[PDB]
Amino acid sequence: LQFAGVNIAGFDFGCGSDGTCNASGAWPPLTQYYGADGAGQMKHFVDDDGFNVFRLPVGWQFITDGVAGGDIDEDNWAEYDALVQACLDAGASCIVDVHNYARFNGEIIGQGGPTNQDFAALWSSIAAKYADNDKIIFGVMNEPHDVPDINLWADSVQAAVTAIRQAGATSQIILLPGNNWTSAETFVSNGSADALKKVTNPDGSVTNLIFDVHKYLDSDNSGTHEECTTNNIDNAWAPLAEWLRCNGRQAFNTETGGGNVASCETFMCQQVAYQNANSDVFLGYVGWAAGNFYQGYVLGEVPTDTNGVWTDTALVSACLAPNA
Known about the structure:
The PDB classes it as hydrolase. By secondary structure, this protein is of the alpha/beta class.
Protein backbone atom coordinates (compact mmCIF):
# COMPACT_ATOMS: atom_id res chain seq x y z
CA LEU A 1 0.00 0.00 0.00
CA GLN A 2 2.86 2.51 0.38
CA PHE A 3 4.55 1.41 -2.90
CA ALA A 4 3.65 -0.61 -5.89
CA GLY A 5 6.05 -1.03 -8.81
CA VAL A 6 7.58 -3.12 -11.51
CA ASN A 7 11.11 -4.27 -12.31
CA ILE A 8 12.52 -2.75 -15.46
CA ALA A 9 15.01 -5.41 -16.63
CA GLY A 10 17.86 -5.17 -19.07
CA PHE A 11 21.09 -4.00 -17.43
CA ASP A 12 21.03 -7.35 -15.56
CA PHE A 13 20.98 -9.67 -18.57
CA GLY A 14 24.20 -11.68 -18.62
CA CYS A 15 24.21 -11.83 -14.81
CA GLY A 16 24.35 -15.47 -13.72
CA SER A 17 23.25 -16.68 -10.29
CA ASP A 18 26.95 -17.21 -9.39
CA GLY A 19 27.72 -13.46 -9.50
CA THR A 20 29.43 -13.58 -12.90
CA CYS A 21 28.31 -10.83 -15.24
CA ASN A 22 29.01 -10.98 -18.91
CA ALA A 23 29.16 -7.12 -18.82
CA SER A 24 28.95 -7.28 -22.65
CA GLY A 25 25.55 -9.08 -22.40
CA ALA A 26 23.84 -6.13 -20.62
CA TRP A 27 21.00 -4.56 -22.56
CA PRO A 28 19.58 -1.23 -21.39
CA PRO A 29 15.77 -0.99 -21.44
CA LEU A 30 15.75 2.45 -23.07
CA THR A 31 15.23 3.62 -26.63
CA GLN A 32 18.73 4.97 -27.44
CA TYR A 33 20.88 1.99 -26.46
CA TYR A 34 18.57 0.06 -28.84
CA GLY A 35 16.18 -1.38 -26.30
CA ALA A 36 12.55 -1.04 -25.26
CA ASP A 37 11.01 2.29 -24.25
CA GLY A 38 11.44 1.85 -20.46
CA ALA A 39 11.00 5.56 -19.99
CA GLY A 40 7.67 5.21 -21.83
CA GLN A 41 6.78 2.04 -19.95
CA MET A 42 7.35 3.99 -16.76
CA LYS A 43 5.25 7.03 -17.80
CA HIS A 44 2.34 4.69 -18.45
CA PHE A 45 2.82 2.61 -15.33
CA VAL A 46 2.57 5.84 -13.25
CA ASP A 47 -0.05 7.75 -15.24
CA ASP A 48 -2.50 5.02 -16.14
CA ASP A 49 -1.94 2.26 -13.52
CA GLY A 50 -0.85 4.19 -10.42
CA PHE A 51 2.55 2.55 -9.88
CA ASN A 52 5.00 4.28 -7.57
CA VAL A 53 8.43 2.71 -7.76
CA PHE A 54 10.64 0.87 -10.22
CA ARG A 55 13.41 -1.54 -9.54
CA LEU A 56 16.33 -1.04 -11.87
CA PRO A 57 18.53 -4.11 -11.84
CA VAL A 58 22.14 -3.81 -12.88
CA GLY A 59 25.39 -5.71 -12.27
CA TRP A 60 28.47 -4.75 -10.27
CA GLN A 61 30.66 -5.63 -13.22
CA PHE A 62 28.71 -3.24 -15.36
CA ILE A 63 29.06 -0.45 -12.85
CA THR A 64 32.82 -0.87 -12.57
CA ASP A 65 33.67 -2.54 -15.95
CA GLY A 66 34.80 -5.86 -14.44
CA VAL A 67 36.26 -4.82 -11.08
CA ALA A 68 35.20 -6.00 -7.59
CA GLY A 69 35.54 -2.57 -6.02
CA GLY A 70 34.04 0.91 -6.15
CA ASP A 71 35.70 2.75 -9.02
CA ILE A 72 32.68 3.65 -11.20
CA ASP A 73 33.13 3.48 -14.95
CA GLU A 74 31.59 6.68 -16.34
CA ASP A 75 30.46 5.45 -19.76
CA ASN A 76 28.50 2.61 -18.27
CA TRP A 77 27.16 4.79 -15.44
CA ALA A 78 25.92 7.27 -18.05
CA GLU A 79 23.58 4.60 -19.46
CA TYR A 80 22.34 3.48 -16.05
CA ASP A 81 21.80 6.99 -14.75
CA ALA A 82 19.64 7.66 -17.88
CA LEU A 83 17.23 5.00 -16.65
CA VAL A 84 17.22 6.33 -13.08
CA GLN A 85 16.54 9.75 -14.57
CA ALA A 86 13.71 8.31 -16.67
CA CYS A 87 12.17 6.85 -13.59
CA LEU A 88 12.58 10.00 -11.64
CA ASP A 89 11.15 11.86 -14.66
CA ALA A 90 8.10 9.57 -14.57
CA GLY A 91 7.60 11.00 -11.04
CA ALA A 92 8.41 7.90 -9.01
CA SER A 93 10.86 6.61 -6.38
CA CYS A 94 13.63 4.34 -7.56
CA ILE A 95 15.42 1.26 -6.39
CA VAL A 96 18.99 0.91 -7.47
CA ASP A 97 19.51 -2.83 -7.20
CA VAL A 98 22.92 -4.53 -7.57
CA HIS A 99 22.03 -7.93 -9.09
CA ASN A 100 24.96 -10.16 -8.02
CA TYR A 101 23.56 -12.83 -5.68
CA ALA A 102 26.17 -11.84 -3.09
CA ARG A 103 28.90 -13.03 -5.40
CA PHE A 104 31.53 -11.72 -7.82
CA ASN A 105 32.52 -14.37 -10.35
CA GLY A 106 31.52 -17.41 -8.29
CA GLU A 107 32.96 -16.21 -4.97
CA ILE A 108 30.88 -14.95 -2.06
CA ILE A 109 31.34 -11.44 -0.73
CA GLY A 110 32.75 -11.50 2.80
CA GLN A 111 33.21 -15.24 2.50
CA GLY A 112 35.79 -16.12 -0.15
CA GLY A 113 35.01 -13.35 -2.65
CA PRO A 114 35.48 -9.62 -2.37
CA THR A 115 35.89 -8.16 1.07
CA ASN A 116 33.32 -6.15 2.87
CA GLN A 117 35.47 -3.14 2.06
CA ASP A 118 35.52 -3.81 -1.72
CA PHE A 119 31.70 -3.87 -1.54
CA ALA A 120 31.27 -0.92 0.79
CA ALA A 121 33.50 0.97 -1.61
CA LEU A 122 30.94 0.31 -4.34
CA TRP A 123 28.05 1.57 -2.27
CA SER A 124 29.87 4.71 -1.18
CA SER A 125 30.31 5.56 -4.89
CA ILE A 126 26.70 4.74 -5.80
CA ALA A 127 25.39 6.61 -2.75
CA ALA A 128 27.55 9.65 -3.45
CA LYS A 129 25.69 9.81 -6.79
CA TYR A 130 22.06 10.45 -5.75
CA ALA A 131 22.72 11.28 -2.01
CA ASP A 132 20.54 14.38 -1.85
CA ASN A 133 17.72 12.78 -3.89
CA ASP A 134 15.33 11.20 -1.36
CA LYS A 135 13.34 9.38 -4.09
CA ILE A 136 16.12 6.77 -4.34
CA ILE A 137 16.00 3.45 -2.52
CA PHE A 138 19.23 1.59 -2.07
CA GLY A 139 18.78 -2.10 -2.83
CA VAL A 140 21.99 -3.48 -1.28
CA MET A 141 21.91 -6.85 -3.06
CA ASN A 142 19.57 -9.01 -5.07
CA GLU A 143 18.85 -12.58 -3.88
CA PRO A 144 21.65 -13.93 -1.73
CA HIS A 145 21.61 -17.73 -1.75
CA ASP A 146 23.60 -20.77 -0.58
CA VAL A 147 25.48 -18.53 1.82
CA PRO A 148 27.13 -20.63 4.55
CA ASP A 149 27.34 -17.96 7.38
CA ILE A 150 24.56 -15.39 7.64
CA ASN A 151 26.01 -13.40 10.51
CA LEU A 152 28.94 -12.70 8.28
CA TRP A 153 26.57 -11.63 5.54
CA ALA A 154 24.68 -9.32 7.88
CA ASP A 155 28.15 -7.87 8.57
CA SER A 156 28.77 -7.17 4.89
CA VAL A 157 25.34 -5.63 4.65
CA GLN A 158 26.32 -3.48 7.67
CA ALA A 159 29.42 -2.16 5.97
CA ALA A 160 27.30 -1.21 2.94
CA VAL A 161 24.81 0.64 5.09
CA THR A 162 27.53 2.55 6.83
CA ALA A 163 29.21 3.35 3.52
CA ILE A 164 25.92 4.65 2.20
CA ARG A 165 25.10 7.00 5.11
CA GLN A 166 28.67 8.20 5.08
CA ALA A 167 28.23 9.37 1.51
CA GLY A 168 25.37 11.43 2.96
CA ALA A 169 22.37 9.39 1.86
CA THR A 170 20.82 9.89 5.19
CA SER A 171 17.15 10.17 4.17
CA GLN A 172 16.80 7.10 1.98
CA ILE A 173 15.47 3.61 2.46
CA ILE A 174 18.01 0.88 2.38
CA LEU A 175 16.83 -2.61 1.64
CA LEU A 176 18.57 -5.47 3.44
CA PRO A 177 18.39 -8.92 1.88
CA GLY A 178 18.80 -12.32 3.51
CA ASN A 179 19.31 -15.91 2.47
CA ASN A 180 17.69 -18.53 0.22
CA TRP A 181 17.11 -16.07 -2.64
CA THR A 182 15.64 -13.79 0.05
CA SER A 183 12.67 -16.15 0.10
CA ALA A 184 9.98 -14.70 2.33
CA GLU A 185 8.87 -18.20 3.31
CA THR A 186 12.24 -18.93 5.04
CA PHE A 187 13.35 -15.43 6.00
CA VAL A 188 12.70 -15.85 9.69
CA SER A 189 13.28 -19.62 10.01
CA ASN A 190 16.64 -19.69 8.16
CA GLY A 191 18.14 -17.10 10.51
CA SER A 192 18.24 -14.07 8.28
CA ALA A 193 15.79 -11.81 10.16
CA ASP A 194 17.46 -11.89 13.56
CA ALA A 195 20.91 -11.32 12.08
CA LEU A 196 19.75 -8.42 9.90
CA LYS A 197 17.85 -7.03 12.86
CA LYS A 198 21.32 -6.24 14.26
CA VAL A 199 22.11 -3.95 11.29
CA THR A 200 21.87 -0.31 12.33
CA ASN A 201 22.55 3.17 10.91
CA PRO A 202 25.62 4.96 12.36
CA ASP A 203 23.57 6.83 15.05
CA GLY A 204 22.38 3.38 16.42
CA SER A 205 18.87 3.38 14.87
CA VAL A 206 16.96 1.14 12.43
CA THR A 207 15.23 4.05 10.69
CA ASN A 208 14.63 3.41 6.99
CA LEU A 209 16.23 -0.03 7.06
CA ILE A 210 13.67 -2.25 5.43
CA PHE A 211 14.08 -5.93 4.72
CA ASP A 212 14.00 -7.22 1.12
CA VAL A 213 12.07 -10.39 0.30
CA HIS A 214 11.10 -12.19 -2.85
CA LYS A 215 8.39 -14.79 -3.33
CA TYR A 216 6.92 -16.38 -6.44
CA LEU A 217 3.66 -18.33 -6.85
CA ASP A 218 4.67 -21.47 -8.71
CA SER A 219 5.23 -24.85 -7.05
CA ASP A 220 9.01 -24.55 -6.44
CA ASN A 221 9.20 -20.74 -5.93
CA SER A 222 11.35 -20.54 -9.08
CA GLY A 223 9.03 -18.19 -11.00
CA THR A 224 9.74 -20.09 -14.19
CA HIS A 225 6.37 -21.82 -14.51
CA GLU A 226 3.33 -20.17 -16.00
CA GLU A 227 0.80 -21.73 -13.60
CA CYS A 228 0.45 -20.22 -10.13
CA THR A 229 -0.34 -22.66 -7.31
CA THR A 230 -0.58 -20.47 -4.20
CA ASN A 231 -0.89 -17.07 -2.58
CA ASN A 232 1.79 -17.64 0.09
CA ILE A 233 -0.42 -16.19 2.86
CA ASP A 234 -0.35 -19.11 5.25
CA ASN A 235 3.19 -20.22 4.57
CA ALA A 236 4.96 -16.85 4.11
CA TRP A 237 3.17 -13.53 4.43
CA ALA A 238 1.20 -14.30 7.58
CA PRO A 239 4.16 -15.73 9.65
CA LEU A 240 6.38 -12.95 8.41
CA ALA A 241 3.95 -10.20 9.33
CA GLU A 242 3.53 -11.67 12.81
CA TRP A 243 7.26 -11.47 13.29
CA LEU A 244 7.67 -8.08 11.66
CA ARG A 245 4.82 -6.59 13.64
CA CYS A 246 5.90 -7.53 17.11
CA ASN A 247 9.55 -6.72 16.28
CA GLY A 248 8.76 -3.14 15.15
CA ARG A 249 10.11 -3.71 11.66
CA GLN A 250 8.92 -3.65 8.09
CA ALA A 251 9.54 -5.60 4.89
CA PHE A 252 9.21 -4.91 1.18
CA ASN A 253 8.53 -7.57 -1.41
CA THR A 254 10.86 -6.60 -4.26
CA GLU A 255 10.11 -9.48 -6.57
CA THR A 256 6.90 -11.31 -7.29
CA GLY A 257 4.75 -12.34 -10.21
CA GLY A 258 3.40 -15.07 -12.43
CA GLY A 259 1.93 -16.16 -15.73
CA ASN A 260 -0.70 -14.11 -17.50
CA VAL A 261 -3.26 -16.84 -16.83
CA ALA A 262 -6.40 -17.41 -14.77
CA SER A 263 -4.75 -19.25 -11.87
CA CYS A 264 -2.36 -16.37 -11.37
CA GLU A 265 -5.06 -13.77 -11.79
CA THR A 266 -6.76 -15.28 -8.74
CA PHE A 267 -3.80 -16.09 -6.42
CA MET A 268 -1.83 -12.95 -7.22
CA CYS A 269 -4.93 -11.04 -6.14
CA GLN A 270 -5.43 -12.82 -2.84
CA GLN A 271 -1.77 -11.96 -2.25
CA VAL A 272 -1.87 -8.28 -3.17
CA ALA A 273 -5.12 -7.93 -1.17
CA TYR A 274 -3.39 -9.46 1.86
CA GLN A 275 -0.33 -7.28 1.52
CA ASN A 276 -2.60 -4.13 1.57
CA ALA A 277 -4.50 -5.50 4.54
CA ASN A 278 -1.11 -5.68 6.30
CA SER A 279 0.23 -2.31 5.06
CA ASP A 280 1.65 -1.49 8.49
CA VAL A 281 4.53 -4.00 8.08
CA PHE A 282 4.73 -4.44 4.30
CA LEU A 283 5.59 -1.26 2.31
CA GLY A 284 4.85 -2.72 -1.10
CA TYR A 285 5.39 -5.12 -3.95
CA VAL A 286 7.30 -4.88 -7.22
CA GLY A 287 6.23 -7.14 -10.06
CA TRP A 288 8.89 -9.11 -11.81
CA ALA A 289 9.25 -8.12 -15.22
CA ALA A 290 8.89 -5.34 -17.69
CA GLY A 291 11.89 -3.66 -19.36
CA ASN A 292 12.97 -5.67 -22.37
CA PHE A 293 11.82 -9.19 -22.09
CA TYR A 294 10.36 -10.59 -25.33
CA GLN A 295 6.59 -10.74 -25.76
CA GLY A 296 6.16 -14.37 -24.69
CA TYR A 297 8.33 -14.27 -21.57
CA VAL A 298 6.67 -16.53 -19.04
CA LEU A 299 6.46 -13.78 -16.34
CA GLY A 300 6.26 -10.84 -18.71
CA GLU A 301 4.65 -7.58 -17.61
CA VAL A 302 5.66 -5.50 -20.67
CA PRO A 303 2.97 -3.15 -22.00
CA THR A 304 2.45 -2.13 -25.60
CA ASP A 305 2.61 1.24 -27.35
CA THR A 306 0.10 1.54 -30.16
CA ASN A 307 0.59 5.17 -31.29
CA GLY A 308 0.69 6.60 -27.78
CA VAL A 309 -1.76 4.03 -26.30
CA TRP A 310 -0.56 1.52 -23.76
CA THR A 311 -2.03 -1.96 -23.42
CA ASP A 312 -1.18 -3.90 -20.31
CA THR A 313 -0.76 -7.59 -20.00
CA ALA A 314 -3.43 -9.64 -18.31
CA LEU A 315 -1.91 -9.79 -14.83
CA VAL A 316 -1.10 -6.11 -14.45
CA SER A 317 -4.50 -4.89 -15.60
CA ALA A 318 -6.19 -7.47 -13.37
CA CYS A 319 -4.31 -7.82 -10.08
CA LEU A 320 -0.99 -5.95 -9.97
CA ALA A 321 -1.93 -2.38 -10.95
CA PRO A 322 -3.22 -0.38 -7.97
CA ASN A 323 -6.10 0.72 -10.32
CA ALA A 324 -8.09 -1.72 -9.45
